[PDB]
Write a protein that binds this DNA or RNA. Structure first.
Ligand SMILES: Nc1nc2c(ncn2[C@H]2C[C@H](O)[C@@H](COP(=O)(O)NP(=O)(O)OP(=O)(O)O)O2)c(=O)[nH]1
Ligand SMILES: [Mg+2]
Ligand SMILES: [Mg+2]
Ligand SMILES: [Mg+2]
Length: 329
DNA sequence: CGGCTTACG
DNA sequence: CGTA
DNA sequence: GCCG
């Protein structure tokens, strides 16, 4: 079992679901307290279990596994012996964890903002609604749409959304393409949003595209919120999506990349977020190359690797290729 | 011990 | 600060 | 919290 998540296949569904879910609670709680190192270790340990070929049934099976030390092994031991880990349960029911989870789930609210509100005594969404002077326009939109945004997006929703985005993209720039990325590209059957990557086969033609796309979507009445309701290339918006007799708000992410960068953007925005983070860490620490969603840089030669495909990038990094369905770290 | 992310909005 |  |  290699130490980096990008060195092993991680399928969407696996054989250690309960154990990984417990470790991810602790990871989440570490992030609520600002402990990014502990968050990473618990995230990485959970990911190791997702990559295992069978269930962990005894402690000895944790021997030699990367990112399992005293703390994560004790968590697994208690789940194996009693079905529950007291630390995890204490976190689950704590007022701090529940409120930080509630607040950070709001679109436009991160850990710093949620922590400030918590310290001021706020605890519920209605607490926030009563203090609208505390809220950015983005957070007001996240708060008003919170109930719809907490409803999982379904794979059936995704196809209708992609068609309306493609229609607006095609008017904005004939020949531009829309590629589904994020969790649905990794095979997820539901998600918190829908992620699209847009490009054009003629390098440079994608410049200035996303303002034109957003203006067309907004004119069609499909945009409930976006940051530009000047030049921009990413939009994190809220879409109006049809439903039986009505509609629901859905988060949609749109990203534009030139075709030269498209493989790097596709790799970055397909995720998972831990997979991509580990891939960039592997690139820097093990290969001495700087990877991001725009390219792959050799700091010694001061040169960028050209890539025509994700397969190119895995090869540049000396990694076996993983299809998106195996990037569910 | 140092290290653990990234550009863009 | 937020996207996260 | 764990790795190197
Ligand atoms: N660097 C970084 N990139 C991130 C982060 N979160 C997301 N991204 C970028 C990089 C990710 O690869 C990309 C897509 O992640 P989502 O759409 O946020 N989530 P997914 O589709 O996996 O699932 P679902 O939507 O169902 O929750 O967004 C983060 O914390 N950090
Ligand atoms: Mg997504
Ligand atoms: Mg997204
Ligand atoms: Mg230390």
């Amino acid at each position: 079992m290699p130490a980096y998540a990008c060195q092993r296949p991680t399928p969407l569904t696996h054989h250690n679901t309960g154990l990984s879910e417990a470790l991810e609670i602790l990871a989440e709680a570490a992030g609520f307290e600002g402990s990014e190192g502990r968050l990473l270790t618990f995230c990485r340990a959970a990911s190791v279990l997702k990559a295992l070929p069978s269930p962990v049934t005894t402690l000895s099976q944790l021997q030699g596994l990367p990112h399992f030390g005293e703390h994560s092994s004790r968590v697994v031991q208690e789940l194996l012996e009693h079905g529950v880990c007291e630390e995890v349960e204490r976190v689950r029911r704590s007022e701090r964890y529940q409120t930080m989870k509630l607040f950070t789930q709001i679109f436009g609210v991160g850990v710093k903002t949620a922590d400030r509100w918590y310290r001021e005594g706020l605890r519920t969404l209605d607490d926030l609604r009563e203090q609208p002077q505390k809220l950015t326009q983005q957070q007001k939109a996240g708060l008003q749409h919170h109930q719809d945004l907490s409803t999982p997006v379904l794979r059936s929703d995704v196809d209708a959304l992609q068609q309306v985005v493609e229609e607006a993209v095609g008017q904005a720039l004939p020949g531009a393409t829309v590629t589904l990325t994020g969790g649905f590209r990794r095979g997820k059957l539901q998600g918190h949003d829908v992620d699209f990557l847009i490009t054009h086969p003629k390098e440079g033609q994608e410049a200035g595209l996303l303002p034109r796309v957003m203006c067309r979507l907004q004119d069609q009445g499909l945009i409930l919120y976006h940051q530009h309701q000047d030049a921009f290339e990413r939009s994190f918006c809220i879409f109006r999506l049809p439903q039986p007799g009505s509609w629901k708000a859905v988060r949609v992410d749109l990203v534009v990349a030139p075709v030269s960068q498209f493989p790097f953007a596709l790799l970055g925005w397909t995720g998972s977020k831990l997979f991509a983070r580990e891939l960039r860490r592997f690139s820097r620490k093990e290969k001495g190359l700087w990877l991001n969603s725009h390219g792959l840089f050799d700091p010694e030669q001061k040169t960028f690797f050209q890539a025509a495909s994700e397969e190119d990038i895995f090869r540049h990094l000396g990694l076996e290729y993983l299809p998106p369905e195996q990037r569910n770290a």
